[PDB]
Symmetry: T
Subunit: 68 residues, 12 copies
Amino acid sequence: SNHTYRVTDIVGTSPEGVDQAIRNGINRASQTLHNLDWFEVVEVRGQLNDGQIAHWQVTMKVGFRLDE
Amino acid sequence: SNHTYRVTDIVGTSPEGVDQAIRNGINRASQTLHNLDWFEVVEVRGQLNDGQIAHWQVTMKVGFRLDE
Amino acid sequence: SNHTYRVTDIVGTSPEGVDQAIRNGINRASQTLHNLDWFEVVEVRGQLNDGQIAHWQVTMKVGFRLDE
Amino acid sequence: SNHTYRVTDIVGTSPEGVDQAIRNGINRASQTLHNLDWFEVVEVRGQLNDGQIAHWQVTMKVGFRLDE
Amino acid sequence: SNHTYRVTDIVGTSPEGVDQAIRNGINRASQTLHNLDWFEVVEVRGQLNDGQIAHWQVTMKVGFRLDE
Amino acid sequence: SNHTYRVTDIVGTSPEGVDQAIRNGINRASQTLHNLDWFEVVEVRGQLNDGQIAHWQVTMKVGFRLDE
Amino acid sequence: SNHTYRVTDIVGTSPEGVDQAIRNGINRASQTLHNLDWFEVVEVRGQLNDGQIAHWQVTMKVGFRLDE
Amino acid sequence: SNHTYRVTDIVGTSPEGVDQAIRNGINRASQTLHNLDWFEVVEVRGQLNDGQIAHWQVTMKVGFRLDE
Amino acid sequence: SNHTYRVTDIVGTSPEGVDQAIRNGINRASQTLHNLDWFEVVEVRGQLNDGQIAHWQVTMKVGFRLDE
Amino acid sequence: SNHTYRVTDIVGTSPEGVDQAIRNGINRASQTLHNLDWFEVVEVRGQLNDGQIAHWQVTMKVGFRLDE
Amino acid sequence: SNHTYRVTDIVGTSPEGVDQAIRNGINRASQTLHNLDWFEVVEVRGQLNDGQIAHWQVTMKVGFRLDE
Amino acid sequence: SNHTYRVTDIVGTSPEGVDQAIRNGINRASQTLHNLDWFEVVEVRGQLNDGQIAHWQVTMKVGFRLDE
């Protein structure tokens, strides 16, 4: 009822696409941040090599509960 | 001719992903709002549950013709 | 004293210009929405054909008093 | 789980303050819009007269479930 | 008639809260600026001191009619 | 070369349209502000009465040279 | 089909007004950029000179098809 | 010394209102983050439960001095 | 060491989805623009027909190294 | 006392650079506006003259205490 | 008087600082783009390595006159 | 590989200027945050004291690689 959350930005990356970039970022975030509650996608970027998409980079706001 | 459009925000949700969240939102919107012309994705959120991405929420601007 | 307003987006269009696009949008909006109080221009676009301006499109926030 | 929400802007007003302006807006909105789920305060204004605050105006994003 | 308004930013402050910070700012503004018409809240800040909220600072757009 | 400018917001109004609202605002501003150099249109609003545009309100950033 | 567009910013200018500033900008843009599809007005500025509005400057996003 | 600050987002919650949501968030933040200096309110949200306000959520930028 | 980049907006389109809209836009952009380095998604739209998604349109900032 | 601040925009200019443009603007502002407390840089522009940087313009929010 | 300008984004880089990053970008831009008139700094970034600033990156809006 | 980054805000301060404020912030940040990759300048402020610029405050987004 009086829960407090903290939000930081995490950047997930994947050669495969936006969806996998998000999962990679959330998976890695979950290991150092406990109580991950939600994320909001705030930016989608790509690294190009020739005219080909080499890396997808997804910036997410990530909310997590502070312990009580 | 001189078509007039209205725009409101709709939030589509799905356990499955962004794509299905959008289709669910558009399908349900289409049943009360007629002449849907376009949508603009404005926000993508996810709820985590049991260490999984449980729910996707996509906020869309949805434009519809007033005229038929 | 404690009046409540609602705001939606309306897109007016006109071959003539910005001013007529707004009037067309307000006139058409006034026929389904009652008690129109104000509008705020949020976007002005033009559709070009053969490098000439065919259509003006003006997106407006439109506020209206809710009845009782 | 596959619920769809719609969001519009509602402006509550009160001579008394921000809090009462919000409650007035939500109360009146709840009478035409069913299944009100959340609101987000987006703007707080005042009408001034003789260097005194006569009216508070609070613009809120208001989300409501579409029936199923 | 064809009234003209000017708008500047005013920062009200109070140890007590947002509401009193606004009133303090408007009261002090009204003494040098005549014909105050409206304000729009643009920013709410707080200074923490000894692990307590010591000051609230509210930035407001303040509109006033120019004399004729 | 080392000229300093100040910028404030002025709201011009006219029953006739955007262009006349701007001229009315600039004319009235020029009487109390000296050395008016430029303006930038930042907002266009209207007061509606029935479904008819009664007043146009144009907010302008207005720059003026400080004397030396 | 799967048309690709490019968008750049163009600033049209005119002593006469906003409308002519836009036409001047679009006309000149159309001579190096082919397949102009749309423009979005993003900024309207005016230079004052000799107590008159001397120059209008309109910044437009201009979209053009790559394809013909 | 040339003091360095860090800023994160914290979400305070309260059934009671905005003011208490802020205090709850700041109090809880102060227990893991040392040397809290300031906060800026960036979002105020409310959960409705059968058309009554159940829960307030306030997102704040929170600045704190890094030790030396 | 002192590389210079340029950035323009590109709109990719696809009947298939966001991912393919981006690839189509990047592929076509790479044929007139050399040394594509990165892209940033700035807008995702869909054109609806009979309340079904016909076309995805993705606006991207696209950065490319200038030659010597 | 509960101090009240006013904020206006000032544009400082210098042939030399950003830093000197700011100091010129603040110095000149300090002569008509009393009790200058803070500034926030909001825009940095440069005029080119045959492909060399001739003039810097820095727009700043400037806060000053109102007397009591 | 009826001059038309075009604006694109250019990213200058330098190991030395913001000022040199801008000059590098403007110098290189001036070689392919003729009639450079102004720039507006829109973003300043750094590449960090071993907690040290290796590269400065400055994104600038750059305006240039189209030939007549 | 599929590197994950985190981003927080850091405020560097210096009596000397923007450049030194950034370096002070990055240096102090590097001592608690490992694997600093980039920063983005988001805000530049100055405190005025005795009619002089006493402190520069630069807010930066700071990205760092998460360990694996």
